[PDB]
Amino acid sequence: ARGPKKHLKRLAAPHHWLLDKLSGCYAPRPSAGPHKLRESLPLIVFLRNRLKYALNGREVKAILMQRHVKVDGKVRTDTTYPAGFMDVITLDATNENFRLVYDVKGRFAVHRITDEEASYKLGKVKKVQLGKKGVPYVVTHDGRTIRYPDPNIKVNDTVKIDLASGKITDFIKFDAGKLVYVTGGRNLGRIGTIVHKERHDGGFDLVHIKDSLDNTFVTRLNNVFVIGEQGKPYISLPKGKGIKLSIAEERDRRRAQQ
Amino acid sequence: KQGFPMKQGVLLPTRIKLLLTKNVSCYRPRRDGERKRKSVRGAIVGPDLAVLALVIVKKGEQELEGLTDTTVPKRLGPKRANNIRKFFGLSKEDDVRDFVIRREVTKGEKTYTKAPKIQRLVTPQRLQRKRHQRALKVRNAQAQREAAAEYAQLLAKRLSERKAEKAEIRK
Amino acid sequence: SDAVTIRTRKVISNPLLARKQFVVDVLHPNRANVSKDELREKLAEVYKAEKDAVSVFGFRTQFGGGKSVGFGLVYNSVAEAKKFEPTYRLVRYGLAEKVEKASRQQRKQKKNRDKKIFGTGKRLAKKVARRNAD
Amino acid sequence: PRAPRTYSKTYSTPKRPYESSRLDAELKLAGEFGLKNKKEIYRISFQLSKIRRAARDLLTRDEKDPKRLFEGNALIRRLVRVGVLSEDKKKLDYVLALKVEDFLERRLQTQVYKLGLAKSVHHARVLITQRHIAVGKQIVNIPSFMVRLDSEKHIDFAPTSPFGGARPGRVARRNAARKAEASG
RNA sequence: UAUCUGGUUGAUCCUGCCAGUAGUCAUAUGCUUGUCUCAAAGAUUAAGCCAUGCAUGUCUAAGUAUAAGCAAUUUAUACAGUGAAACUGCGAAUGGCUCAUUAAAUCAGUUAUCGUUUAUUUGAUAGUUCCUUUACUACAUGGUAUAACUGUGGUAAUUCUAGA
RNA sequence: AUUCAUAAUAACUUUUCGAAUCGCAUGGCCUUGUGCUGGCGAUGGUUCAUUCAAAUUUCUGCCCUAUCAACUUUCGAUGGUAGGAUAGUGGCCUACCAUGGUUUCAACGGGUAACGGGGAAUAAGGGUUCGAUUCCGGAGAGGGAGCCUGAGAAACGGCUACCA
């Protein structure tokens, strides 16, 4: 390999796309974008495999090129555009609306949304910095770059971004009790409240979380996402409010819904 | 013989190899950056030749038919606006949309003059784009200046509030 | 077919391609199978559309005969169907015509032959003719 | 290239291939259940071995361990659903008590014979493979088709078969034509 | 499903190996051959040699088109559509094959870039472009070339190309 | 954690950038002029940030051989400092200097019928053997070297030379 990679094979693709293993040899390599190649759901898989609104790569390209699909506030035509965690995928043609979010098993949910909540999104700043001419600014996990943010905001706090014009609307500070949404690791999709952090010097920061069932767990800070106050999120939550049931509990729920 | 072109600049009557490169005659690079070892005959004239390419720099006193006697046209008239202007010796205000060469072409009995399009032509669309550029740049400057002012006031208010907080401190 | 009673399930509408798509099944007891025309006409009349506006494909006859399942796709207009369906399916439906592209090997041969010629080659044809005469 | 299509073997040939006791015992099973090869016996014994291995693992597991409960419940549930186990013997150790004859008894061959549709087990197999039997309402012609504990109510002659009310077969139809021609 | 059996002796108990037995997404081969699903396949010896044919090109409304192309300017005398050729921008540095070389090398888990570069995507982001500092600047926009094409050619021959 | 971010002074630069590009739409304002203003975009562009990457790098781990016991230090070996070079660290290279570095806890050398791993076969438990091969990471286009374009190549379905 003497350059960038431009292919992906289905076994190499991240599992949480739920791509089947015998439908062709290749996978949609999410083109460069605002989110990592992993932890990002391309529009090709989103439309074809989740919504089932189109059966082919050809058909998905038709959807995108007639511009019925717009991610966040902006129309996108990249068949493999890497829609990420907090992305709002609009689909105005059908008057549908979704926000990407993880179910408790660790997969992007099909979580539908209302327009008053599709107009905005949350963002966990990955750093605060000074741009040129002395301009302080922040960048979110989505790469969105916001200038002149509120000076009380620090790293890994949460921004509430308007899709009409990416700008600080308010922020939630990272301290004990704040509702967090665990984005990755073995607890991907969990929701809980911080009880305290470790703050390792040099080492990876760690935070202990307990949820409404007191099913406490521990997760790295590069992996958490505060999205509101105790039991009051800044968005809607997917099915189940991020509660993880045991295998026995899941079997019971399936039997009870039979 | 063997059809090796006589390269310009190479000072010997023999055939020699050259790593011919772009912007040089005798060789056309098939891939960008490519260089190929071609064979070129020297600029010194010799018996080796089969043909000699000559162009007349001063006409003699008698005619050659395939030469000065007859002529062929400049196959294409100018296509850029200022080149039309220089060709016709026009002044500043002379129009060009009607001095374009309406070269005739007849498809059977269907005659028409498909004249060349004119580039670098002054047209209101370009003025629209230029003025749009100006408004865009000034709008951005105004917006950036006003936003900087707002944050400056916000940080100033933060300073005042911290001063009030320290007043609450220290009793 | 005797007692087709064609059933349609999971009938989700997509305004994106402006159609209604469903998993279709056909019960054909005592008859071998049902064909594209007989499926499309019945689907067209039940969905209030022209015969061409509705598309069906993927019919697998289930073991023992009796019934098969395919996929049904009813468009919002003939123009929508013409734009959205693949050309193979249109010529499958008889609306369109098979594209007359040559075989791959002959087609690829043409590419590599014309790759050897730079530009139009009209001057080259004249020059080759003059030398061949010479 | 493509992801690999996984596969595995379903039977285990025995060590000590020529124990006269085992050969006689397995032929008794083959004769009384109308099996074609010893491969069927090996497959059922391999299957029983797999279930017994899993049940032994889980039975030595500590009581009301989450893994034991979940896995044991699933194991017994599919056992009783296929009907090999019986609801009176709901506990897990009864799986260890199971024998290869139990799975053979629930095979489609013997269920057709027990329901009375067949003259014998060999007549049953011919009837199954010739697409004259049907479960639910659909023709099934795998003799090894396991019947769930609820499909005995649906095993009977196939609607496409002459024994299910369909067209009068082929040789009878040919012989009927010959009779009409000879009387013509 | 934590198992052994035949062989040294007239006979016994042993060390001991030979042989047996069962498995191999383990190779080859022999005999034989109905059906369904699935499916490996010139690695092993020779990363030995290769005929032939293909395997990387690409255009929209949105860079340049007077083809002496196609249909019409039923929208037009500068262009108006479509389009060969060609220049221009991207790509050709991915994929595919093989395992020859390599024994702290690679690779695996785990790290750091406070130690660097990064086409592209994404988000922001150039009043100082008068700078030799208000016409170097015509700013209703400046200049130059050269392809494509025509025509004369050369070589047995190339995806060669000269001169105008 | 920083000589960080970023800002401020003095100059330098053979000087980069800051738009002479393109499609649709043609709306408003009157002092009605081809006047002033105008939308939806496409392309392009400096710095930062993101993404896709890339290059180095910490620690630990590798088959058989003593019928390989000392190895490295000409003309780099270990290190110091300064400079070139690099996109960047660095004996990567150069210059001066010190004489160091590895080893019986197996250095160094040889063989490998050795690409490494996820894994495969077979086992009560421990293990034994296999992994060229569908995934990841390396390396190569007959051997070897050199190098143009580009962001990315020691590229070979790209060039240069030698070898066959």
UniProtKB/Swiss-Prot annotation, chain A:
Cross-link (Glycyl lysine isopeptide (Lys-Gly) (interchain with G-Cter in ubiquitin)): K61, K133, K160, K167, K173, K178, K210, K232
SMART domains reported for this sequence: S4
Localisation: Cytoplasm
Chain ranges of the S4 RNA-binding domain: 41-104
InterPro entries registered for this protein in UniProt: KOW (IPR005824), Rib_uL2_dom2 (IPR014722), Ribosomal_eS4 (IPR000876), Ribosomal_eS4_C (IPR032277), Ribosomal_eS4_central_region (IPR013845), Ribosomal_eS4_central_sf (IPR038237), Ribosomal_eS4_KOW (IPR041982), Ribosomal_eS4_N (IPR013843)
An annotated GO cellular component: 90S preribosome
Signal peptide region: none
Keyword Magnesium in annotation: no
Alphabetically ordered keywords of this record: Cytoplasm, Isopeptide bond, Phosphoprotein, Ribonucleoprotein, Ribosomal protein, RNA-binding, rRNA-binding, Ubl conjugation
Any GO BP annotation: cytoplasmic translation
Other facts noted in the record for this chain: Present with 573 molecules/cell in log phase SD medium.
Family: Belongs to the eukaryotic ribosomal protein eS4 family.
PANTHER family: 30S/40S RIBOSOMAL PROTEIN S4 (PTHR11581), SMALL RIBOSOMAL SUBUNIT PROTEIN ES4 (PTHR11581:SF0)
Main function: Component of the ribosome, a large ribonucleoprotein complex responsible for the synthesis of proteins in the cell. The small ribosomal subunit (SSU) binds messenger RNAs (mRNAs) and translates the encoded message by selecting cognate aminoacyl-transfer RNA (tRNA) molecules. The large subunit (LSU) contains the ribosomal catalytic site termed the peptidyl transferase center (PTC), which catalyzes the formation of peptide bonds, thereby polymerizing the amino acids delivered by tRNAs into a polypeptide chain.
UniProt name for this protein: Small ribosomal subunit protein eS4A
From Swiss-Prot, chain B:
Subunit annotation: Component of the small ribosomal subunit (SSU). Mature yeast ribosomes consist of a small (40S) and a large (60S) subunit. The 40S small subunit contains 1 molecule of ribosomal RNA (18S rRNA) and 33 different proteins (encoded by 57 genes). The large 60S subunit contains 3 rRNA molecules (25S, 5.8S and 5S rRNA) and 46 different proteins (encoded by 81 genes). Interacts with snoRNA U3. uS11 interacts with MPP10. Component of the ribosomal small subunit (SSU) processome composed of at least 40 protein subunits and snoRNA U3.
Phosphothreonine modified-residue sites: T106
Residues of the full protein shown: 58 to 228 of 236
Gene source species: Saccharomyces cerevisiae (strain ATCC 204508 / S288c) (Baker's yeast)
Compartments it resides in: Cytoplasm; Nucleus, Nucleolus
An example Gene Ontology molecular-function term: structural constituent of ribosome
Domain of life of the source: Eukaryota
Gene Ontology biological process terms in this record: maturation of SSU-rRNA from tricistronic rRNA transcript (SSU-rRNA, 5.8S rRNA, LSU-rRNA); translation
Keywords (A to Z) from UniProt: Cytoplasm, Isopeptide bond, Nucleus, Phosphoprotein, Ribonucleoprotein, Ribosomal protein, Ribosome biogenesis, rRNA processing, Ubl conjugation
Record cross-link Glycyl lysine isopeptide (Lys-Gly) (interchain with G-Cter in ubiquitin), residues: K59, K74, K92, K157
Additional remarks: Present with 66000 molecules/cell in log phase SD medium. There are 2 genes for eS6 in yeast.
Encoding gene, per UniProt annotation: RPS6A
Protein name: Small ribosomal subunit protein eS6A
Stated family: Belongs to the eukaryotic ribosomal protein eS6 family.
Any one cellular-component term (Gene Ontology): small-subunit processome
Curated annotation (Swiss-Prot), chain C:
Gene Ontology process terms (BP): cytoplasmic translation; maturation of SSU-rRNA from tricistronic rRNA transcript (SSU-rRNA, 5.8S rRNA, LSU-rRNA)
Coiled coil ranges: none
GO-annotated molecular function: structural constituent of ribosome
Protein keywords: Acetylation, Cytoplasm, Isopeptide bond, Phosphoprotein, Ribonucleoprotein, Ribosomal protein, Ubl conjugation
Glycyl lysine isopeptide (Lys-Gly) (interchain with G-Cter in ubiquitin) crosslink, residue number(s): K20
Residues carrying Phosphoserine: S13, S55
Keyword Methyltransferase recorded: no
SUPFAM superfamilies in UniProt: Ribosomal proteins S24e, L23 and L15e (SSF54189)
InterPro entries associated with the record: eRP_eS24_sf (IPR053709), Ribosomal_eS24 (IPR001976), Ribosomal_eS24_CS (IPR018098), Ribosomal_uL23/eL15/eS24_sf (IPR012678)
Region annotated Disordered, chain positions: 101-134
Record keyword Ubl conjugation present: yes
Compositionally biased residues, Basic residues: 104-114, 123-134
One Pfam family it belongs to: Ribosomal_S24e
One Gene Ontology CC term in the entry: cytosolic small ribosomal subunit
Subcellular location: Cytoplasm
S-S bridge residues: none
Job of this protein: Component of the ribosome, a large ribonucleoprotein complex responsible for the synthesis of proteins in the cell. The small ribosomal subunit (SSU) binds messenger RNAs (mRNAs) and translates the encoded message by selecting cognate aminoacyl-transfer RNA (tRNA) molecules. The large subunit (LSU) contains the ribosomal catalytic site termed the peptidyl transferase center (PTC), which catalyzes the formation of peptide bonds, thereby polymerizing the amino acids delivered by tRNAs into a polypeptide chain.
Family of the protein in this entry: Belongs to the eukaryotic ribosomal protein eS24 family.
Miscellaneous notes: There are 2 genes for eS24 in yeast.
Listed HAMAP family: Ribosomal_eS24
Name under which the protein is recorded: Small ribosomal subunit protein eS24A
Gene name tied to this protein: RPS24A
UniProtKB/Swiss-Prot annotation, chain D:
Domain S4 RNA-binding: 106-180
Short name of any one Pfam family annotated for the protein: S4
SUBUNIT field: Component of the small ribosomal subunit (SSU). Mature yeast ribosomes consist of a small (40S) and a large (60S) subunit. The 40S small subunit contains 1 molecule of ribosomal RNA (18S rRNA) and 33 different proteins (encoded by 57 genes). The large 60S subunit contains 3 rRNA molecules (25S, 5.8S and 5S rRNA) and 46 different proteins (encoded by 81 genes). Interacts with snoRNA U3. uS11 interacts with MPP10. Component of the ribosomal small subunit (SSU) processome composed of at least 40 protein subunits and snoRNA U3.
Keywords per UniProt: Cytoplasm, Isopeptide bond, Nucleus, Phosphoprotein, Ribonucleoprotein, Ribosomal protein, Ribosome biogenesis, RNA-binding, rRNA processing, rRNA-binding, Ubl conjugation
Annotated function: Component of the ribosome, a large ribonucleoprotein complex responsible for the synthesis of proteins in the cell. The small ribosomal subunit (SSU) binds messenger RNAs (mRNAs) and translates the encoded message by selecting cognate aminoacyl-transfer RNA (tRNA) molecules. The large subunit (LSU) contains the ribosomal catalytic site termed the peptidyl transferase center (PTC), which catalyzes the formation of peptide bonds, thereby polymerizing the amino acids delivered by tRNAs into a polypeptide chain.
Primary site of residence: cytoplasm
Entry annotated with the keyword Membrane: no
Range of residues in the leader sequence: none
Residues covered by region (Disordered): 159-184
Modified residues (Phosphoserine): S183
